[PDB]
């Protein structure tokens, strides 16, 4: 693609500059270029990729919800057409990210920290497709399948305080609550995840403790809304 002529190291440096500049579309394009070099990503580089696309799809999701609300209130073709324009652009970002995960980030990810991170991302981008889907059942099952594989590996290979494992459980619990219409599964997963993390905190340094408790606070925030 357009980044084929730039050094991998230059694409990563420019991703970090684009982040500082709040240029998330540029950041995502630089990280897509880095992934297409074909080398595995480091932990820092995986996080750059995730932050870039999360910011991009986050803008699109926020816009889609504003337009969907207006469209529902309105029930001229303009509101539907513009909601459909934003929806298609969102689907294209999800398809781009799922494309990178399947070509070939997941298949070359052997360590638990890489493989769980990428399978969580695959679950998250299917979830974003599911949010706008009205094939919806098959998209939901794709999200569930990715999250379940990531959960199985995380429970065998990572301590319960591992921030990737915690973020996975957080996002899978929100999948259950509002995509799968399984609020009881969401609450059960959030509580078990919180309680098992609480009991492992004793093992951590000050810096790991801060990283784990930050995500545990998001589980608590959801449980407070759900109960």
């Amino acid at each position: 693609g357009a980044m084929g002529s730039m050094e991998r190291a230059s694409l990563i440096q420019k991703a970090k500059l684009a982040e500082q500049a709040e240029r998330y579309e540029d950041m995502a394009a630089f990280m897509k270029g880095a992934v297409e070099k074909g080398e595995e990503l480091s932990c820092e580089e995986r996080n750059l990729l995730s932050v870039a696309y999360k910011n991009v799809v986050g803008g699109q999701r926020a816009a889609w919800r504003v337009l969907s609300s207006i469209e529902q209130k309105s029930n001229g073709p303009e509101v539907r057409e513009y909601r459909e324009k934003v929806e298609t652009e969102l689907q294209g970002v999800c398809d781009t990210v799922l494309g990178l995960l399947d070509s070939h980030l997941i298949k070359e990810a052997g360590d638990a920290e890489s493989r769980v991170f990428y399978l969580k991302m695959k679950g998250d981008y299917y979830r974003y497709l599911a949010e706008v889907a009205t094939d919806k059942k098959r998209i939901i099952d794709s999200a569930r399948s990715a999250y379940q594989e990531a959960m199985d590996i995380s429970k065998k290979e990572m301590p319960p305080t591992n921030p990737i494992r915690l973020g996975l459980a957080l996002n899978f619990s929100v999948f259950h609550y509002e995509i799968a219409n399984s609020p009881e599964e969401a609450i059960s997963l959030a509580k078990t995840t919180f309680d098992e993390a609480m009991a492992d905190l004793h093992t951590l340094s000050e810096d790991s403790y801060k990283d784990s408790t930050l995500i545990m606070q998001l589980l608590r925030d959801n449980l407070t809304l759900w109960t």
Binding site: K54, V56, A62, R65, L218
Partner: peptide, 12 residues
């Protein structure tokens, strides 16, 4: 919509 608490940038 009430959005729940997912991991990473609260970008939406």
């Amino acid at each position: 919509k009430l959005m729940f608490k997912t991991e990473g940038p609260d970008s939406d």
